[PDB]
Design a protein around this ligand. Structure first.
Ligand SMILES: CC(C)=CCC/C(C)=C/CC[C@H](C)CCOP(=O)(O)OP(=O)(O)O
Ligand SMILES: CC(C)=CCC/C(C)=C/CC[C@H](C)CCOP(=O)(O)OP(=O)(O)O
Ligand SMILES: [Mg+2]
Ligand SMILES: [Mg+2]
Ligand SMILES: [Mg+2]
Ligand SMILES: [Mg+2]
Lengths: 291, 306
């Protein structure tokens, strides 16, 4: 089943991978938060300078530490409120959670690297991530059973992949005009890449999520919808992954010609989406997390 | 349990950008030569090679990755199967390998590893002069000799003292054979007088010791589990009759001391001429890439996980 997570393109890894992974474990220790999160970041942004790769690695660590620590809606609503204050630029006062201080450091370091325009886009993607998490949490407690369409539409935001795609611009040191960033084909390539990354994860993490009574997983949602066996649910999930890869590859050639400079930056951005798709698969296949 | 904090080097490694592509190509090579028996996708032997030869061209890196894979496939038979306890079977196999290293063509019913070694020999012959193949072949011969010596220890239920173990370990780990590949990876030639210089040999010895003793600390659990005692931790524990934690501390102390020796001896390389000293500084950088590669890969490799 795992062997069927395949792409017609290949990834790359930063030569700095291990130095970043060590500095991530050092960073997590400093803020009081096996793992190899730096080796995901090193594959996801393989051309990035060491300074920018380290921010991306520390951000990716934060998301995993967040996902792990959360293991109660009133408590979740309270925490998300303040994270967003930090993201928009509120000082981490006393009695703040370790994660809040860590997020304050990431915002601080990104502010040195990116314009206000970028910080807003990143912040909005993070807000939608929190919203999607609160939605999944309610479903869990209330025992709600979302269909495949609903799960997949929510999964695009619950995985925070869009926040990670925002870092591609900083890694690649590219600027895209509003009209190119928001173009329907660019959005459809981002959606395809996000679905591929999430559905790859779901196929690899379903055993983990079954054990902990979580059903927010494509294989588990497909199983419930079709009233079918686990092997058929896995087969259906990998068919959707295969179809989404075909869709990404096809739409790559549908990007309009704006001008030389804009299309150069767009080619780098889409190459960045491919690096992230391969990074997710290459990293997850080896990761202790899904063993 | 975590020894990262006690395996520190004052130099850093690097990894080839093609690390994952190289590992996938190694699995295909392994499959092609029928070396995969029974989690092939978590071996990650390409990810060690990618770190050990980080600046190598994809073709030379692929030979290095397949060679490192070959050593692990071979090693697992010796260190976990009956051939490692049968000197007469080991002598028979080594005679076939040695024939192949000299350039003999594999017979129809030579074992998978013999066919695989012949492929590596052919590919190295395309990339290396005859003098190199002789140096490589001799280091591999000493590896076989050291493994037969380990086999006799397993057979007799013997444990060597620290001095004897460490002296044998420099050959049983095949690190010198892997060091030979640095020359091809970095596309350098050293003249005989530079290659054999006392200080160059002492730097290779220290680098080899560091790699083996780092491995011994990280691999003592899986080796205890198979009843193997060819491990600095287990030999120290045998000699001093001390606790396992004391043995580990003593092993990590020797590792630290060897790192210090390597770093200080770096500055003792004589000036021969511009060309040779540029090639030697490239080579010594190569030893540092290997030292880091060994630790960086081993800390996260499934091979050394409980
Ligand atoms: C954890 C996180 C939000 C992001 C890490 C970085 C990243 C975008 C990785 C891709 C894998 C997938 C989208 C994780 C989603 O969280 P999920 O809870 O499905 O991850 P898990 O299967 O590892 O528990
Ligand atoms: C397998 C082999 C001879 C070499 C692979 C490449 C290499 C030079 C690796 C460095 C670590 C160490 C020398 C492994 C061999 O010893 P050992 O048998 O203790 O390896 P293990 O602890 O991984 O089983
Ligand atoms: Mg998951
Ligand atoms: Mg989860
Ligand atoms: Mg072994
Ligand atoms: Mg060992």
């Amino acid at each position: 089943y795992r062997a069927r997570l395949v792409y017609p393109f290949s990834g790359a890894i930063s030569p700095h991978a291990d130095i970043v992974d060590q500095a991530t474990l050092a960073w997590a220790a400093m803020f009081g938060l096996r793992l190899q999160y730096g080796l995901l970041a090193a594959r996801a942004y393989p051309r990035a300078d060491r300074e920018m790769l380290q921010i991306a690695a520390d951000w990716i660590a934060w998301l995993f530490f967040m996902d792990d620590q959360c293991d109660d809606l009133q408590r979740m609503i309270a925490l998300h409120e303040r994270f967003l204050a930090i993201l928009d630029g509120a000082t981490p006062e006393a009695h703040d959670c370790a994660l809040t201080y860590a997020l304050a450091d990431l915002r601080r370091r990104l502010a040195l690297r990116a314009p206000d325009n970028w910080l807003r886009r990143f912040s909005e993607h993070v807000r939608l991530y929190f919203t999607a998490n609160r939605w999944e949490t309610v479903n869990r407690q209330r025992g709600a059973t979302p269909n495949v369409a609903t799960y997949c539409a929510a999964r695009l935001f619950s995985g925070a992949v869009y926040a990670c795609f925002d870092l591609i611009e900083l890694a690649e040191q590219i600027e895209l005009p509003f009209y190119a960033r928001h173009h329907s084909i660019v959005q459809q390539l981002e959606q395809a890449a996000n679905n591929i990354i999430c559905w790859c994860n779901d196929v690899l993490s379903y055993p983990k999520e079954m054990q902990h009574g979580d059903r927010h997983n494509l294989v588990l949602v497909i199983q419930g919808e079709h009233q079918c066996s686990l092997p058929e649910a896995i087969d259906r999930a990998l068919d959707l992954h295969a179809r989404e890869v075909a869709t990404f590859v096809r739409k790559r050639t549908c990007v309009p010609y704006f001008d030389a400079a804009v299309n150069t930056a767009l080619e780098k951005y889409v190459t960045g989406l491919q690096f992230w798709i391969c990074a997710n698969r290459d990293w997850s296949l080896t990761a202790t997390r899904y063993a």
